[PDB]
Enzyme design. Sequence first.
Site, PDB file in Angstrom:
ATOM      1  N   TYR B 509      -4.708  17.261 -29.175  1.00  0.00           N
ATOM      2  CA  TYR B 509      -4.783  17.820 -27.815  1.00  0.00           C
ATOM      3  C   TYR B 509      -5.707  16.928 -27.015  1.00  0.00           C
ATOM      4  O   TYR B 509      -5.225  16.164 -26.196  1.00  0.00           O
ATOM      5  CB  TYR B 509      -5.216  19.280 -27.822  1.00  0.00           C
ATOM      6  CG  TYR B 509      -5.118  19.882 -26.442  1.00  0.00           C
ATOM      7  CD1 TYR B 509      -3.872  20.143 -25.857  1.00  0.00           C
ATOM      8  CD2 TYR B 509      -6.247  20.088 -25.685  1.00  0.00           C
ATOM      9  CE1 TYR B 509      -3.780  20.669 -24.574  1.00  0.00           C
ATOM     10  CE2 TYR B 509      -6.169  20.597 -24.396  1.00  0.00           C
ATOM     11  CZ  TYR B 509      -4.934  20.885 -23.849  1.00  0.00           C
ATOM     12  OH  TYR B 509      -4.859  21.392 -22.560  1.00  0.00           O
ATOM     13  N   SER B 592       1.473  19.072 -23.897  1.00  0.00           N
ATOM     14  CA  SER B 592       0.677  19.228 -22.699  1.00  0.00           C
ATOM     15  C   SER B 592      -0.319  18.053 -22.547  1.00  0.00           C
ATOM     16  O   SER B 592       0.109  16.889 -22.589  1.00  0.00           O
ATOM     17  CB  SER B 592       0.009  20.618 -22.691  1.00  0.00           C
ATOM     18  OG  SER B 592      -0.609  20.838 -21.442  1.00  0.00           O
ATOM     19  N   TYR B 593      -1.618  18.313 -22.380  1.00  0.00           N
ATOM     20  CA  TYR B 593      -2.590  17.224 -22.462  1.00  0.00           C
ATOM     21  C   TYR B 593      -2.376  16.392 -23.742  1.00  0.00           C
ATOM     22  O   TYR B 593      -2.469  15.165 -23.730  1.00  0.00           O
ATOM     23  CB  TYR B 593      -4.034  17.728 -22.408  1.00  0.00           C
ATOM     24  CG  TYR B 593      -4.997  16.624 -21.988  1.00  0.00           C
ATOM     25  CD1 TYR B 593      -5.395  15.634 -22.887  1.00  0.00           C
ATOM     26  CD2 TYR B 593      -5.468  16.541 -20.681  1.00  0.00           C
ATOM     27  CE1 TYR B 593      -6.240  14.605 -22.501  1.00  0.00           C
ATOM     28  CE2 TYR B 593      -6.327  15.521 -20.287  1.00  0.00           C
ATOM     29  CZ  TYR B 593      -6.707  14.550 -21.214  1.00  0.00           C
ATOM     30  OH  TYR B 593      -7.570  13.541 -20.829  1.00  0.00           O
ATOM     31  N   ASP B 670       9.590  23.774 -15.947  1.00  0.00           N
ATOM     32  CA  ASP B 670       8.152  23.698 -16.134  1.00  0.00           C
ATOM     33  C   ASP B 670       7.486  23.614 -14.766  1.00  0.00           C
ATOM     34  O   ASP B 670       7.606  22.607 -14.046  1.00  0.00           O
ATOM     35  CB  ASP B 670       7.825  22.494 -17.004  1.00  0.00           C
ATOM     36  CG  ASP B 670       6.397  22.505 -17.538  1.00  0.00           C
ATOM     37  OD1 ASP B 670       5.455  23.051 -16.887  1.00  0.00           O
ATOM     38  OD2 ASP B 670       6.224  21.957 -18.638  1.00  0.00           O
ATOM     39  N   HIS B 702       6.475  25.507 -19.338  1.00  0.00           N
ATOM     40  CA  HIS B 702       5.509  24.769 -20.126  1.00  0.00           C
ATOM     41  C   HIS B 702       5.310  25.305 -21.555  1.00  0.00           C
ATOM     42  O   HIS B 702       4.919  24.553 -22.444  1.00  0.00           O
ATOM     43  CB  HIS B 702       4.170  24.759 -19.414  1.00  0.00           C
ATOM     44  CG  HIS B 702       3.283  23.643 -19.835  1.00  0.00           C
ATOM     45  ND1 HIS B 702       3.673  22.321 -19.772  1.00  0.00           N
ATOM     46  CD2 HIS B 702       2.022  23.645 -20.322  1.00  0.00           C
ATOM     47  CE1 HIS B 702       2.692  21.559 -20.219  1.00  0.00           C
ATOM     48  NE2 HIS B 702       1.668  22.333 -20.530  1.00  0.00           N
TER      49      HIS B 702
HETATM   50  N1  LIG Z   1      -4.135  23.650 -16.639  1.00  0.00           N
HETATM   51  C1  LIG Z   1      -5.002  23.457 -17.841  1.00  0.00           C
HETATM   52  C2  LIG Z   1      -5.954  24.628 -18.081  1.00  0.00           C
HETATM   53  C3  LIG Z   1      -6.765  24.434 -19.399  1.00  0.00           C
HETATM   54  N2  LIG Z   1      -7.446  25.733 -19.719  1.00  0.00           N
HETATM   55  C4  LIG Z   1      -8.354  26.203 -18.609  1.00  0.00           C
HETATM   56  C5  LIG Z   1      -9.453  26.901 -19.309  1.00  0.00           C
HETATM   57  N3  LIG Z   1     -10.468  27.746 -18.955  1.00  0.00           N
HETATM   58  N4  LIG Z   1     -11.044  28.016 -20.178  1.00  0.00           N
HETATM   59  C6  LIG Z   1     -12.168  28.852 -20.380  1.00  0.00           C
HETATM   60  C7  LIG Z   1     -12.622  28.966 -21.654  1.00  0.00           C
HETATM   61  C8  LIG Z   1     -11.956  28.258 -22.725  1.00  0.00           C
HETATM   62  N5  LIG Z   1     -10.880  27.461 -22.557  1.00  0.00           N
HETATM   63  C9  LIG Z   1     -10.408  27.337 -21.261  1.00  0.00           C
HETATM   64  C10 LIG Z   1      -9.395  26.633 -20.692  1.00  0.00           C
HETATM   65  C11 LIG Z   1      -8.287  25.682 -20.999  1.00  0.00           C
HETATM   66  C12 LIG Z   1      -5.772  24.097 -20.575  1.00  0.00           C
HETATM   67  O1  LIG Z   1      -4.999  22.979 -20.200  1.00  0.00           O
HETATM   68  C13 LIG Z   1      -4.120  23.267 -19.132  1.00  0.00           C
HETATM   69  C14 LIG Z   1      -3.240  22.071 -18.940  1.00  0.00           C
HETATM   70  C15 LIG Z   1      -3.738  20.790 -18.943  1.00  0.00           C
HETATM   71  C16 LIG Z   1      -2.872  19.699 -18.697  1.00  0.00           C
HETATM   72  F1  LIG Z   1      -3.370  18.462 -18.645  1.00  0.00           F
HETATM   73  C17 LIG Z   1      -1.526  19.883 -18.466  1.00  0.00           C
HETATM   74  C18 LIG Z   1      -1.051  21.193 -18.473  1.00  0.00           C
HETATM   75  C19 LIG Z   1      -1.907  22.248 -18.712  1.00  0.00           C
HETATM   76  F2  LIG Z   1      -1.412  23.467 -18.725  1.00  0.00           F
END
Ligand SMILES: N[C@H]1C[C@@H](N2Cc3nn4cccnc4c3C2)CO[C@@H]1c1cc(F)ccc1F
EC number: 3.4.14.5
Lengths: 728, 728
Positions: B509, B592-593, B670, B702
Site C-alpha cells: 500500500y 489504490s495508492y 470508480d 473503487h
Molecule cells: N482518499 C484516501 C483516504 C485515505 N484514508 C483517509 C483516512 N483518515 N484516517 C483516519 C485514521 C486512520 N486511517 C485513515 C485514513 C485513510 C485512504 O486512501 C484513500 C485513497 C488514496 C489514494 F491515493 C487513492 C484512492 C483512495 F481512496
Amino acid sequence: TRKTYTLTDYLKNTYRLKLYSLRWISDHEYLYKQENNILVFNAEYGNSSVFLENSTFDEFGHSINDYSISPDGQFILLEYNYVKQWRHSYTASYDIYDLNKRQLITEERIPNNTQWVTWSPVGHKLAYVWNNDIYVKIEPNLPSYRITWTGKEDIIYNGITDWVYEEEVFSAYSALWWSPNGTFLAYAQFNDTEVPLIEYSFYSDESLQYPKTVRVPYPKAGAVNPTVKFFVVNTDSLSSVTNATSIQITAPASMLIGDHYLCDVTWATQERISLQWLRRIQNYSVMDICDYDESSGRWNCLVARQHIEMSTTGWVGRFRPSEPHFTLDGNSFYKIISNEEGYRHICYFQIDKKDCTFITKGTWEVIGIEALTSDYLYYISNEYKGMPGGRNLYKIQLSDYTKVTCLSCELNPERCQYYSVSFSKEAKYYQLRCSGPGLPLYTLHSSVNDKGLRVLEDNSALDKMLQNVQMPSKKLDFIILNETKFWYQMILPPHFDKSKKYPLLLDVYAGPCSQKADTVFRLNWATYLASTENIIVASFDGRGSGYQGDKIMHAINRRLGTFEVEDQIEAARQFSKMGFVDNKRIAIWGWSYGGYVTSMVLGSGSGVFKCGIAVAPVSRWEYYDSVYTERYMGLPTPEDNLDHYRNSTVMSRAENFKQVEYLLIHGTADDNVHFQQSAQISKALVDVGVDFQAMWYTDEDHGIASSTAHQHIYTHMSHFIKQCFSLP
Amino acid sequence: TRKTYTLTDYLKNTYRLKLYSLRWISDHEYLYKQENNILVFNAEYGNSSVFLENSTFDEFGHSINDYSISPDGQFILLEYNYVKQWRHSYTASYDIYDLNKRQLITEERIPNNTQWVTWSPVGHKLAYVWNNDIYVKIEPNLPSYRITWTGKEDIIYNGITDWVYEEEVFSAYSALWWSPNGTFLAYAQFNDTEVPLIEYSFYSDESLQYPKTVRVPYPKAGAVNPTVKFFVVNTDSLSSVTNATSIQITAPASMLIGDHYLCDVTWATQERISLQWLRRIQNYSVMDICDYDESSGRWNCLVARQHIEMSTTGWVGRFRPSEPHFTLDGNSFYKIISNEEGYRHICYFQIDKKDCTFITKGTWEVIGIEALTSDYLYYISNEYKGMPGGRNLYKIQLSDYTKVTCLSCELNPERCQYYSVSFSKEAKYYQLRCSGPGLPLYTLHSSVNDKGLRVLEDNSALDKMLQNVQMPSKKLDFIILNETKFWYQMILPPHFDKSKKYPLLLDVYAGPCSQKADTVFRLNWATYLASTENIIVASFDGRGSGYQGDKIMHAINRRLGTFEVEDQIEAARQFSKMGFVDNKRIAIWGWSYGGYVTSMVLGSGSGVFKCGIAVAPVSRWEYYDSVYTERYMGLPTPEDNLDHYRNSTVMSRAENFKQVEYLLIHGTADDNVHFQQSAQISKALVDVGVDFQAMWYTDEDHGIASSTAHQHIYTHMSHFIKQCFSLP
Ligand SMILES: N[C@H]1C[C@@H](N2Cc3nn4cccnc4c3C2)CO[C@@H]1c1cc(F)ccc1F
Ligand SMILES: *[C@@H]1O[C@H](CO)[C@@H](O[C@@H]2O[C@H](CO)[C@@H](O)[C@H](O)[C@H]2NC(C)=O)[C@H](O)[C@H]1NC(C)=O
Ligand SMILES: *[C@@H]1O[C@H](CO)[C@@H](O[C@@H]2O[C@H](CO)[C@@H](O)[C@H](O)[C@H]2NC(C)=O)[C@H](O)[C@H]1NC(C)=O
Ligand SMILES: *[C@@H]1O[C@H](CO)[C@@H](O[C@@H]2O[C@H](CO)[C@@H](O)[C@H](O)[C@H]2NC(C)=O)[C@H](O)[C@H]1NC(C)=O
Ligand SMILES: *[C@@H]1O[C@H](CO)[C@@H](O[C@@H]2O[C@H](CO)[C@@H](O)[C@H](O)[C@H]2NC(C)=O)[C@H](O)[C@H]1NC(C)=O
Ligand SMILES: *[C@@H]1O[C@H](CO)[C@@H](O[C@@H]2O[C@H](CO)[C@@H](O)[C@H](O)[C@H]2NC(C)=O)[C@H](O)[C@H]1NC(C)=O
Ligand SMILES: *[C@@H]1O[C@H](CO)[C@@H](O[C@@H]2O[C@H](CO)[C@@H](O)[C@H](O)[C@H]2NC(C)=O)[C@H](O)[C@H]1NC(C)=O
Ligand SMILES: *[C@@H]1O[C@H](CO)[C@@H](O[C@@H]2O[C@H](CO)[C@@H](O)[C@H](O)[C@H]2NC(C)=O)[C@H](O)[C@H]1NC(C)=O
Ligand SMILES: N[C@H]1C[C@@H](N2Cc3nn4cccnc4c3C2)CO[C@@H]1c1cc(F)ccc1F
Ligand SMILES: *[C@@H]1O[C@H](CO)[C@@H](O)[C@H](O)[C@H]1NC(C)=O
Ligand SMILES: *[C@@H]1O[C@H](CO)[C@@H](O)[C@H](O)[C@H]1NC(C)=O
Ligand SMILES: *[C@@H]1O[C@H](CO)[C@@H](O)[C@H](O)[C@H]1NC(C)=O
Ligand SMILES: *[C@@H]1O[C@H](CO)[C@@H](O)[C@H](O)[C@H]1NC(C)=O
Ligand code: NA
C-alpha cells in the site's frame, strides 16, 4: 531455409503492395503523383509532364494532406490540418492556389473549421459547409454567398450528413449535389432535434486533467430518427438577388405517412433530378423524377414518372436502393434490381413507364454499372466461371443485348480474377485494377478498340522480394449444404501437407451481404499465422452472404444471430471432416459484426471451438443504430420483432462461455459500436462467474487503426492464439 | 491429511470471524443484537432482557437495513430502501416506531430519499437532511421545522458533505453536530458552484438502451475547491410561523485570506463549541473556541482562545488535525500533537493559554484518546515492546503523569497485541477488542479497579474449525536501512521450511501514514496464496509510513512516488537475498495508492520483480482530488511543486515495463480514482509497444466489491500470479 512472413513483416509493412492511383482530369489525361511531384499523363501515348513541382509548397508552412484540382484546371484546392471524424467525415483547413498566376489566394479564404468543400463539376465554383451551413463561391478570391441560416451544432445539418446518414445511408459525409453543368446546387437538411445522444469519455493527451464527454446524436434501434428535407438552389442567380431561394422538393405522400429516409440523389440532366426515398421499414422505396419549371421557378415530380421498388422477402437493395444511370437525354435509365429469381441484374427503364426490361440475366449478379455511352454500357459482374467471389468487366451493346463481351476475363486468367475499373471522363480510356489471386496488376486500355495500351504497375519489385519468402497459398472452393453451394477460402501454410493435422482459425464476418471467400490477394495477419505459425485460416460465406442471390442473402431477414451463426459452426465441422484439421485446436475470431458472430458461436455450447477473439462486437441489437439494425431486424416492439431482438443477444449465452477461452477487445472511443456493447458482455460473464481475457484501447474507435494500437492489438491477439494452440 | 485454506474458502467466507458489536446506552447498559432480537445487557452482572422482539416488524413490508434507538429508549428509527452513494453517503427511507405505545408513527413521516438522520444526543429530537436542506423534529409525531432553504443538488449542501469533504476531511456524509444536551444544532454548508465535474459513463442493466453519464463535483489537484460556511441554530426556540435563525461563525482572518477548509467540529460544553480550520496549504491550522452570548444571541470566539497548530516538516495531523477532548467544565482539553521530536503525544491545553504541556513522551506514538475522567485519561498507543504495529490501552493519572498503567498489555500477550476499546457513557466500563495475532477476543471490564468481568466472545468455534486446516503463520520483524529500523511482515506457508526457496508476493500500500506490518489476524487472499499455493506474502513499511514519528512519515513530503517506491524495491532486494526466497519469482501487487506504488516499482527498471498487478491505481497526481493530493504535494503550479507532479507519473516510466508482466485492473464507475487514471497508463504502454494484461469491471467503483465482481477479480488475479510463478 527461406524466411517466413513474420508478425513484424505485417506490422512494419516490409513487403509493400504498389498501387497506381490516377485521377482523370479529362477524356485523355490523368494526374499521377511520383516522387511527390504531380505529373500529368497523356493516356494514348503514355508521355508526361510535371503538372506541379514537388518544391511548390516548401514555403507553405504546413504539411499538405491532399489536393484537388478544379475541373477547368485553373485552381488547386489544398487540404491541410486534417483531423479524422467518423468513417468518411473529417475537419481540415483549405487554401486555394491559382495555377495561372502561380500564386496562393490570400483574400476571402475558406474559413477555419470547414466541414466539407466541393468544386462544381465544370469550371471552378465551390460549395462548402461551415458551422453546419452551406456557402457558395462563384470565384475563389471573391466573397461567399450564404445559402442556409438554420445550421446548428448537433441539431441542424445543411449539406452534410449526421452520424447515421453518413455511416448507413450515404456512405459519405457530403449531402450536396451540383447539377451537371453547375447551375443548380441540390442539398439535404437533417434535423436531429429529438434524436438521443450517445455519450462517452475521451481522455486525450495525459495533460488533460478532466476527461471530455463526447456527445453525438445517434439513434439506436427503435429510437427517434433524424428527419430530412431536400432543396435545390439556382447558383447562377446568386450575384443578382440578395438572398436566393432554396426550392424544396417534398417526399411523396407514400413516404410522408411515416418515418422515412432520403437514400439517393442523382441528377439526370441540367434540369432533371432523381430522388429515391426509403420507408423506415426498408422494404419499400420510391423514386421521383423532378423537372425544373422555368416559368414558375419550381421543381415538379410527375406521378407518371415515379418508380416503386419493393421487396417481399427482405429489404431493398444490397445495403440501399441502387443508383440510376441516365442516358444523355435523361429520358431513360439503367438500374440494378433484383429480378424475379432473386438475382441482381441490369434493368432498363423509360422515365414514364412503370415496367422495365432486364438486359442481363442468369444465376450470377451484376455488382455495379461503371460507365454508359451512346452505344455501350459497361458493368462488373461475378458471371465468369460461376465464381461469386470473382469480378470482371463486361461491355453490352445497347442496340443488341445478345452482344456481351468480357473485357477482362481472359487478360491473365491465372493471375487476375478480381477487377475494378476507372474510366476517363467520357469513357475513352479505362484503367483496369486486378487485385488477385496473384499480385495486383494495373493496366491502361483504349475503349475505341479495347486494346491494352500499357502496364502501369505490375508489382515486379514485390514479386522479387517474395521469392525469398515461404508464403502461404490460398484455396477457394465450395461445399454443398442442402443442395446449395456455399463458398469458403483457406489460407494454407507453406508446404501444406494433407496428411498432417493443422490448427484452424475461423476468420469471421458474416454480416448481411458480406463476402469473405474471394479471389483477392492480401498481405495481412492471416498471412503471418499461416506462414510463420502453420495455422490454417479459413472463412466461410453462409446464409446471409451476398452476390449469390436473394434466396441466400435474405435467409437471415428479421433473424440476425441465427443461420449465419449456425453456418459458421457447421463450416468448422465440415473443415474437420476434411482430415487435415486438428479437431482439438479450432479457434474463431472476428471484428465488428464478426465479433458478434464470434461471440454468438462461442456461446452456442457447440463444443467445436477451443477459443476465440471478439473485437468491438455488437452484443445486443437494441444498442446498434436504427438504419442498419432495422433494415434486417424491423422494429424492436411487441407488435413487430422485439422477441427476436431479445433472443439474439450475446449476454443470454454467458453460461456457455465456461466451455471456451475468450478474449474481448474494444476501443473506448468507438462511436459506431459503443464500448457499452462490450461493457455489457463483460458484466454478464462476471455475473455468471466466467473467466475471460480482456483489453480496452484508450481513445481508439471502431478501426483501432492508430499506428501504435494497431501493432499492439495484433501483438496481443497473436500471443493469445499461440497460447490457445500451444505454439511456442 | 487435512485441507488448506482455499480460494473458495476466502471467496465464500467458509471460516467466519465472530464479532461482538455492542452499543452503550448509558454508564451501565448496552444493546446487542442476537437472533434478530435486540437485548439490553447489564455490564456489571452480564444479565440481559429482550429490548425488542424480532417479530415486532413481521408485517412491516420492507426489509429493514438498520435501526437506531433514541437516547431515551422511547423510539426506534427504522432504516430501509438503502441506496449506497460514495464511501459513507447513502439515501434511505425511515419510519419511527414508538416503543411505549407499541405503534409505528404515521403522522409527519421522514421523507423518502433522506440523506442523513440523527437523534439528538439526549432525549428524542431528530435532525435530517433531505434535498440538501436541514429539517428538525422536536417530537417524532410532529411536523418538521425547515432550517435551511438554499439546498440545491450538486451545488449547495446543508448539513451533508460534498464528495471531497466526505472522502478526505470528515470521513462521513454528515455535517451536523448536536450540542451535548440537544439545545443547539451546528452545521456546515458547502458551496460547489465553481467546482469542476468529473463525468463518466454508467451502463446499468442490459435493458438500458443508452448509457447514463454520471456527473460529480470533484476538484482535482489545483482546481477550484468547494467553499464552506458554519452555522449554529437554537432548536429550543423554533417557531411554526417564523423561519429559523441560524447564527454564522466565521473563520479567523488567518484563514479568510485564501482557500481553506473546516476540518473539525467538537462541542466543549452546552454553550461552547470548538472549530478547527485548515489552510489549503495544509501545514497551518487554527482552532477557535466559541461561547454563546445569552444577551446578544450570538457566538463569540475570543482571539485569546485561539490555538495555532503548524508543521515545518510536513502537513498537520496524520490525515487532518486531531480532535480535542474537553474536560467536564470545558476550560481545558487534551489533544494529540507532534512533539519536538516528531512523535505524536498527548498535550494538555488551557483554553486561554498558548503553551500546552505534553503529558506523554517517548519514541512511540499515541494512536487515540479514548476516554477522559477527572482522574484518568485513557488512550491507545504502540509503546509496548517498542512494536509500532501493536496497540494497547493505557491510563494516565492526571494528577501525576509519571503514573501510567497498561490495561491490556498483560491480559494475554501471546494471543493479543492489537487492541481497540469501547467505553460506556461515563467510562465506568469498557469493552476490549483484541484483533490479533491470535483469533479476536472480546472482553468486558470495569474501570474502578480494572476488573476483567467476562469474556464476551472468544471465537472458540472458529478455532475448532481451523484446527483441521493447514494455516499459514505470520512473521513480524524489521530490517535496518541507514540506521533506521523498518518493519515488515511475511505470511509464511504451512510447514515453512527455511531450506526451501519460495516464490514471494510483495503486498503493497505504502501511502502516507500507512501501516501494512502489524499484529492483526486476517483471513484474506494472502491466506489462500500462502496456505494453498505456498507463496510467501510480504509487506513492508518504509519511508512515509505511520505511527513511528514524523522523521519517517514526513520523509515523502512534497515527494510522493519517491522514497516509498524505492523502499519497497530495497525491501524486496533484501528479501530476495534471504535463503528461503526464490529470486526468480518475486512479484508485487497493490490496490489504490498500492496500485500506484506497484506501477511505479514495475516501471523503475530495478529488475527485481517478474510481474505485478495494479488495481485501480493512481497514475498521475493531477488526476486525484485536491484535499488528499495537495496535503502531500502542495499545488501543481510552477512556483510551488509542478515539476514533481510531472515526474512522478506512471506514464513516464512506460518503456521500463518491457521486462515485466503487468496486469492492470480498474472499475469503470470508480468515482474516487477515475478510470481515466488507468486509461492513461494503458495508452502510454501501447505507445511504447509494451504488451500487458488488462481487465475492466463494468459499473464497479473503487471497492470492486459487488459479490460477483469480487469473486471474479480475485479469481483472475490468482490465475495471473500462478501463471507468473509456474504453479499448477
Ligand atoms: N482518499 C484516501 C483516504 C485515505 N484514508 C483517509 C483516512 N483518515 N484516517 C483516519 C485514521 C486512520 N486511517 C485513515 C485514513 C485513510 C485512504 O486512501 C484513500 C485513497 C488514496 C489514494 F491515493 C487513492 C484512492 C483512495 F481512496
Ligand atoms: C505528349 O506528347 C504530345 C505530342 O508530342 C504533346 O502534345 C503537344 O504536341 C505539340 C505538337 O504540336 C507540341 O507543340 C506541344 O509540346 C504539346 N502541347 C501540349 C499542350 O501538351 C503533349 O504535350 C505530351 N503530353 C504531356 C502530358 O506531356
Ligand atoms: C427541427 O425540428 C424541431 C422539431 O423537433 C423543430 O422545433 C419545433 O419548432 C416549432 C416552431 O415551428 C416550435 O414551436 C416547437 O416547439 C419546436 N419543437 C421542439 C421539440 O423543439 C425545429 O423547428 C426544426 N428546425 C428546422 C430548421 O427545421
Ligand atoms: C434568406 O432567406 C431565408 C428564407 O426566407 C431566411 O431564413 C428565414 O429567416 C427568418 C428570420 O431571420 C426566419 O424567421 C425563418 O424561419 C427563416 N427560414 C428559413 C427557411 O431558414 C434568411 O434569414 C434570409 N437571409 C437574409 C440575410 O435575409
Ligand atoms: C447549364 O444548364 C442550365 C439549365 O438548363 C442553363 O441555364 C439555362 O440557359 C438557357 C439559355 O440557353 C436559358 O434559356 C435558361 O433561362 C437557363 N435556365 C436557368 C434555370 O438558368 C445554363 O445556360 C447552362 N450553363 C452553361 C454554362 O452552359
Ligand atoms: C455559492 O457560491 C457562489 C460563488 O461561487 C455564489 O454565487 C454567486 O457567485 C457568482 C459567481 O458565480 C456571482 O455572480 C455572485 O456575486 C454570487 N452570488 C451573489 C448573490 O452575489 C453563491 O451565491 C453561493 N451560494 C450560496 C447559497 O452561498
Ligand atoms: C441545555 O443547555 C442549555 C444551554 O445551557 C440550557 O438552556 C438554558 O437554560 C436555562 C434554563 O434553566 C435558561 O435560563 C437559558 O436561557 C437557556 N439557554 C439557552 C441558550 O436556551 C438548557 O436548559 C439545557 N437543556 C436541558 C434539556 O437540560
Ligand atoms: C507550508 O508549506 C509551504 C510549502 O512548502 C512553505 O512555503 C514557503 O514558500 C515557498 C514554497 O511554496 C518557498 O519559497 C519557501 O521557502 C517556503 N518556506 C520555507 C521552506 O520555510 C511554508 O513555509 C510552510 N509553512 C510553514 C508554517 O512551515
Ligand atoms: N455500419 C455498417 C455498414 C456496413 N456496410 C459495408 C458496405 N458495403 N457497401 C457497399 C455499398 C453500399 N453500402 C455499403 C456498406 C455499408 C459494414 O458494416 C458496418 C457495421 C455493422 C455492424 F453490425 C457493426 C459495426 C459496423 F461498422
Ligand atoms: C414490409 O415488411 C413488413 C414486416 O415484415 C411486412 O408486414 C410488409 O408486408 C412488408 N412489405 C412488403 C412489400 O412485403
Ligand atoms: C439484571 O439484574 C438486575 C439484578 O438482578 C436486575 O434488577 C436488572 O433489571 C437486570 N438487568 C437487565 C438488563 O435485565
Ligand atoms: C415513500 O414512497 C412511497 C412509495 O411511493 C410512498 O407511498 C410514501 O408516501 C413515501 N413516504 C413519504 C414520507 O413520503
Ligand atoms: C421562509 O423562507 C422561504 C425562502 O426564503 C420563503 O419562501 C418562505 O415564505 C419563508 N417563510 C416564512 C414564514 O417567512
Ligand atoms: Na472474569
